[PDB]
């Protein structure tokens, strides 16, 4: 689930790259003549300011020029009909599948929603099953660096992938950290207990 953080990070990465590009162009058109340049005039703060403002104001997550390409419906206007409406709106989840599709599978209530997503709250119209709401005690992780975990695993009896020979993989336990196969272990039970 991409919350406000990652979405704004995507937008800001794009905007900062554009800002650097504009600074590059402005500096080039000055250094082509030998004369120095003032980076104060090379920085278009409007780039970041207006990009973030536009994306939050219209809900089109992307550049204003590629509005047709951008996904819409992000950044909706907060509902204030009643307090429960506001609370529900602040805990809303969206599947970008596309309401036009007629396959029932993505709209079905999967078993794994237990305790994570409310099984009752969902719009009854064209978006049934695609717009969801968090269960009361559900939480979404913000992420953390795996470096301490990798250091501990190395300190433990885990063997790096380059060192071990391929013959030792068969009976050992592969260890994945954030999808990276980082080594193997011979005593998975004790390792799980320790972790």
């Amino acid at each position: 689930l991409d919350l406000a953080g990652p979405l704004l990070a995507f937008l800001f990465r794009g905007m900062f790259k554009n800002l650097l590009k504009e600074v590059r162009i402005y500096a080039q058109k000055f250094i082509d003549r030998g004369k120095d340049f003032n980076l104060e005039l090379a920085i278009k703060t409007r780039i970041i300011s207006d990009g973030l403002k536009y994306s939050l104001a219209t809900g089109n997550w992307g550049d204003q020029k590629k509005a047709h390409q951008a996904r819409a419906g992000v950044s909706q206007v907060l509902n204030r009909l009643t307090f429960a409406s506001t609370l529900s709106h602040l805990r809303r989840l969206n599947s970008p599948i596309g309401r036009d599709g007629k396959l029932a599978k993505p709209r079905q209530l999967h078993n794994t929603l237990w305790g994570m997503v409310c099984p009752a709250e969902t719009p009854e119209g064209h978006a049934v099953g695609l717009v969801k709401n968090l269960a009361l005690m559900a939480y979404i992780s913000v992420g953390s660096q795996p470096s301490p975990i990798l250091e501990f695993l190395e300190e433990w009896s885990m063997e790096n992938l380059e060192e071990i020979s391929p013959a030792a993989i068969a009976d050992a336990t592969k260890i994945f950290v954030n999808g990276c196969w980082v080594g193997i272990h011979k005593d998975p039970e004790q390792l799980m207990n320790t972790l």
């Binding site: 953080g5 990465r13 920085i43 703060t45 939050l56 950044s75 907060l78």
Partner: protein
């Protein structure tokens, strides 16, 4: 996003080297963030309260600054490294009741003094006076 993602994005950006001979570096190193504020035409730095942003149709945003180092090398590897501190690069809309909102850690009495509802949960932005919520 404010604590880590912005700085990580800025640092991950490759420095730009330009050729016309003289060469430039233009490296960004660290970022600063102020609290939401409004400047009138006189330039007095007043704090923008969320209710004022709602009523005057303002954007509740904070200015973002970054330190920039510029170096120039022409001949004989002479280093002209110069630094521009607190360079303004844009404004970041601030989510209400977050760590960097003016309402952070205010008592119910303080919130009512600001014409804010204590029961208001926050978690949204004010863009041109309009309350905006990001859908996961």
């Amino acid at each position: 996003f404010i604590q880590m993602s912005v700085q990580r994005i800025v640092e991950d950006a490759p420095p730009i080297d330009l050729q016309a001979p003289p060469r430039y570096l233009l490296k960004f190193e660290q970022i600063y963030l102020s609290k939401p504020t409004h400047w009138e035409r006189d330039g007095a730095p007043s704090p923008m309260m969320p209710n004022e942003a709602r009523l005057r149709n303002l954007t509740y945003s904070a200015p973002l600054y970054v330190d920039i180092t510029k170096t120039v090398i022409k001949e004989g590897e002479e280093q002209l490294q110069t630094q521009h501190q607190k360079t303004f690069i844009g404004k970041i809309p601030i989510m209400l009741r977050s760590t960097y909102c003016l309402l952070n850690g205010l008592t119910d009495r303080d919130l009512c003094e600001l014409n804010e509802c204590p029961l208001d949960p926050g978690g949204y932005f004010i863009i041109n006076g309009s309350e905006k919520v990001l859908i996961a």
